[PDB]
Amino acid sequence: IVGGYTCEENSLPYQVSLNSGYHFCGGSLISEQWVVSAAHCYKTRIQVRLGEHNIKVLEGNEQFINAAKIIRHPKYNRDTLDNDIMLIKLSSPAVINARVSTISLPTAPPAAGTECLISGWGNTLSFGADYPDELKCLDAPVLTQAECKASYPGKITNSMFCVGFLEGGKDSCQRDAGGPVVCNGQLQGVVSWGHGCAWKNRPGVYTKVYNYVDWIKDTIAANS
Amino acid sequence: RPDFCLEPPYTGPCKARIIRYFYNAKAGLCQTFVYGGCRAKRNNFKSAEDCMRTCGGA
Ligand SMILES: [Ca+2]
């Protein structure tokens, strides 16, 4: 997260990280046993960490749960990034408490102008490359599809939308992928891609979670 | 000796943080870099050994 701030320590119980020897992506806890992430964050083996604030300093609230199933959307396209969404079933249900809890799926599509909260342990660009130990947060508005397509001619599919600032300076960045864009308590976006981070006229591009509610519900049910 | 060995490391548009190796012709060795998870160029390897086998000496 570039140009953001440190999230309040306890405050985003739904934010998880994906690990495979090291932290490589984020994710969101949507039910006791299911996590939503990005398809480009797929690895054959993944350990999900929950309840983290500082990924290097344990405060006792942290859980370490292996992924039992890792399911990319069947229509994920690794070249165009169309349908960049993924589900992970935890090997055991998360223990629910103040530091580890779920976020709602969206009940309506993202509305332009709505202020959202984007979070993760991604590059902050604060001193050249800077991968922070503490979870970072960014308040940022949903942009119109017109603004999105103007920023990325040729590249914005139906699965995608932009959240951020056309002026640049504030954005998600590397290691943030798979993490949450939450708007009014609902998971509207998954951190996906962008041209650079925090460039002028190049806001982050996010997967539109609302388009996948049925797939998510069906997938979860098919894997009970 | 391939020319792609002389290209700077390419993070790409995706926002994962994946460790990969690239050949640094100024260094004469392979070094680590951050790969975003998609659209890799050819100067991008999963090990330093693989990297040197393809690009070493370039
Ligand atoms: Ca922690």
Q: Residue B33's closest chain A neighbor by CA?
A: A129
The DSSP call for residue A74 is: T
CA-based R_g, chain A, Å: 16
Asked if A172 has any chain B CB less than 8 Å from its own CB, the reply is yes
Which residues in chain A touch residue B38, judged by CB atoms under 8 angstroms apart?
A: 40, 78-79, 81, 193
The closest of A88, A100, A92, A94 to A32, measured between CA atoms, is A94
Residues by chain with Cβ below 5 Å of ion ligand 1: A 52-54
CB A38 within 8 A of CB A191: yes
Structure-token match 């609230």, residue found: A61
Query: How many whole angstroms from B19 Cα to the centroid of ligand 1?
Result: 22
A6: phi then psi, degrees, rounded to nearest 5: -70, 125
- B15: nearest CB among A22, A78, A172: A172
Task: Mention every residue, 6+ apart, whose C-beta is less than 8 A from residue A132.
Answer: A121, A124
Give the Cα separation of B18 and B2 in Å (integer): 24
Give the Cα separation of A151 and A205 in Å (integer): 10
Give the Cα separation of A105 and A102 in Å (integer): 9
Decide if A81 and B14 are in contact by the 8 Å CB cutoff: yes
Token pair recorded at residue A169: 């300076």
Domain with B2 in it: 1-58
Q: How many helices (H) and strands (E) does chain B have?
A: 1, 2
The DSSP call for residue A106 is: P
Q: Residue A152's closest chain B neighbor by CA?
A: B13
Decide if B34 and A24 are in contact by the 8 Å CB cutoff: no
Our count of domains for chain B comes to 1
Q: In chain A, what are the domains? A: 1-12+103-210 (2.40.10.10), 13-102+211-223 (2.40.10.10)
Query: CATH number for the domain including B45?
Result: 4.10.410.10
The closest of A163, A175, A178, A159 to A36, measured between CA atoms, is A178
The closest of A206, A133, A205, A139 to A170, measured between CA atoms, is A139
Q: Residue A203's closest chain B neighbor by CA?
A: B13
| A8 assigned ligand-binding residue | no
The closest of A66, A171, A52, A164 to A122, measured between CA atoms, is A171
Asked if A192 has any chain B CB less than 8 Å from its own CB, the reply is yes
- CA torsion through residues A110, A114, A116, A122, sign: positive
Token pair recorded at residue A167: 């002026």
Query: Nearest 10 degrees: CA dihedral of A20, A23, A25, A27?
Result: 90
Residue count of chain B: 58
| A54 assigned ligand-binding residue | yes
First and final CA of chain B: distance in angstroms?
Answer: 4
Decide if B15 and A192 are in contact by the 8 Å CB cutoff: yes
Q: Which ranges in chain A belong to alpha helices (H)?
A: 145-151, 213-222
Task: Mention every residue, 6+ apart, whose C-beta is less than 8 A from residue A136.
Answer: A1, A4, A5, A6, A7, A119, A120, A121, A122, A124
Give the Cα separation of A194 and A204 in Å (integer): 5
- CA torsion through residues A202, A110, A217, A97, sign: positive
- Least Cα separation, residue B49 to chain A (angstroms): 19
The closest of A210, A201, A49, A186 to A120, measured between CA atoms, is A49
Largest CA distance in chain B: 31
Resolution for this model in angstroms, one decimal place?
1.4
Give the Cα separation of A72 and B5 in Å (integer): 32
Decide if B17 and A174 are in contact by the 8 Å CB cutoff: yes
Query: Coil, strand, or helix at residue B53?
Result: helix
CA of A201: how far to CAs of A68, A169, A175, B46, in Å? 40, 10, 21, 33
Asked if A178 has any chain B CB less than 8 Å from its own CB, the reply is yes
